[model samples]
Target: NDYRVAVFGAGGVGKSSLVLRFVKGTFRESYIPTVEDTYRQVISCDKSICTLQITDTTGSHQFPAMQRLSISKGHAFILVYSITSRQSLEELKPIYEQICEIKGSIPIMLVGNKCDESPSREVQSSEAEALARTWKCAFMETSAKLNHNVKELFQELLNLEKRRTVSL
Candidate 1:
């Protein structure tokens, strides 16, 4: 089976870093903004082998058409935001709304990235969890730099897909 996962967030929110860590298991210290990139990897979970089509979207929204296409086709989403940036958290609302409008309540995980920078954190975990409750989605904090919760994020998505498939 195949699953398409979309990662979306504002610039500097570590969208690419999260995808890179999950797909390649390597972290880049320098931030190179992603215009848009897609990666494919076969992963095993629950005795099943599946192709993960992960799309790393641009934070700049430079390509609206591509964004819409990705949202429409994505089986799941990782809506990323930097823990140190309130604006990033604020910016996720519309993107989440757009995904719901297009895909209608697909599995979405709200990720608060850069948890390693706890000293400078601006978004509180409780606050993010509140938003997640409102959206009826999962919420987690990750640190791509430390590879924290990176694997678990993808694992959660794969499991979500598995459960949804089983339910259908």
Candidate 2:
């Protein structure tokens, strides 16, 4: 069977890049930006077979029903932000609230994407980590451009569901 992992964030937060890199479980040259696309990949749990339905959601907030649907249907959520953009970090607050509202203990991972751009960084690692602590979410920094922590991000999120006894 398959489980859904939803990705949410503001526009230009590298949400697509993270999904593309990880779904391929590797990188490719034909990478493209996303607009509400979903990817499928295989996962293994001990001796059983599992599949991941990773949804890379839209950046716009005009669709309240869509956001609510994602939360209600999603098994795990990845809330992404660009480390260089403080506004991007701020944007996730409402989504997080909605997630908490829908399923108070759903599996969630808070990700700081574009982690390589430290020169103009606005959202510090500590700040994001602290928020993760408050939300009690698993957190990590990733760079799909350089492909840093991309796979690790998904692994941790997968482990989050597993630890919650929502195993395959």
Candidate 3:
């Protein structure tokens, strides 16, 4: 089975950085995002038989409709936001709601990005956690700078997918 995932958030929320770290396993000091979407292939644990199609969408406020269109193709959702920006964190609800509207009951994770910027943290861990609970989804805080919780987030999603397919 193919695991199609979408990473989404408002601009400057480190959405692309999270995907970059997962895909390229490295962080960039400066990233100029193009209007085009980025695609990457990920091999699962049983590499001989499974693969995932991960699509990183553009994070722009003016493109909500476009993002919604992209959500239709995804089986999983990653809603990300910068810990240093409150507004970025707030935007996550709408994005998550949009994805649910397009792909009902899909696995979704709310990621509080830039955990390395703890000194400047604007979104409290509790707040993010509360939203996750309200949405009935998983949540985690990550920092591309410190590489925090990177693997765990992916593992959680992978586990969710495995469980979902097994039950069916």
Candidate 4:
């Protein structure tokens, strides 16, 4: 089976970091803003092998049409935000709304990234969890630099996909 996962978040929210860590198992210290990129990986879970197609979107709204297209095509989403930035956390609301408008209620995981930077954290875990609860989605905090919950994020998405398929 195949799955399309779209990652959306503000710039500097570690969206690229999460993808790189999950797909390549490596992290870069410097920041290189993403225009747009897609990665493919074959993953095995619970005796099943599936192709995971992940789309890493740009933080800039330079391509609204592209974002809409991705939202329409994606089967699941990892809506990420930086725990260290309140703006990043607030930014997810509009993006989430747009996604829902385009794709309806899909599998979305609210992720608070850069959790390793606890000293500078602005968004608390409880706050993110509350929002996730309101949205009726799963929530997780991750740090790509520390390799925390990066793999588990994709695994959770895969599990959601599995359950979705089973029901259908």
Q: Against the unseen true structure, what C-alpha lDDT does each candidate score?
A: 0.86, 0.83, 0.76, 0.87
Error of 4 at 24 (Å): 0.6
TM-score of 2: 0.89
Task: Give model 1's TM-score versus the native structure.
Answer: 0.91
lDDT of 1 by residue, 1-168 (tens): 677889999999899989888888888888887888999887664556767789999988668888899899888899999999999999999898898788653678999999999999999999999999999999999999999999888877666764544111
Worst 10 residues of 1 by lDDT: 159-168
- The full ranking of all candidates by lDDT, starting with the best, is 4, 1, 2, 3
Which 10-residue span in candidate 3 carries the lowest summed lDDT?
159-168
What are the per-residue Cα lDDT tens digits for candidate 2 across 75-151? 88999999999999999999999988888646789999987898989999999999999988988899998989987
Clashing pairs in 2: none
Tell me the spans in candidate 1 whose CA falls farther than 4 Å from its real position: 45-48, 162-168
Decide which is better by TM-score, 2 or 3. 2
- For residues 22-101, what per-residue lDDT tens digits would candidate 3 score against the true structure? 77788887977745466656464443545566677776666767777778877778888999999888877777777666
Per-residue CA lDDT of candidate 4, range 32-134, in tens?
9888899988765345776778999999988989999989888899999999998998989988899878865367899999989999999999999999999
User: Which has the better TM-score: candidate 3, or candidate 4?
Assistant: 4
Model 3 clash count equals 0
Model 3 RMSD in angstroms: 3.0
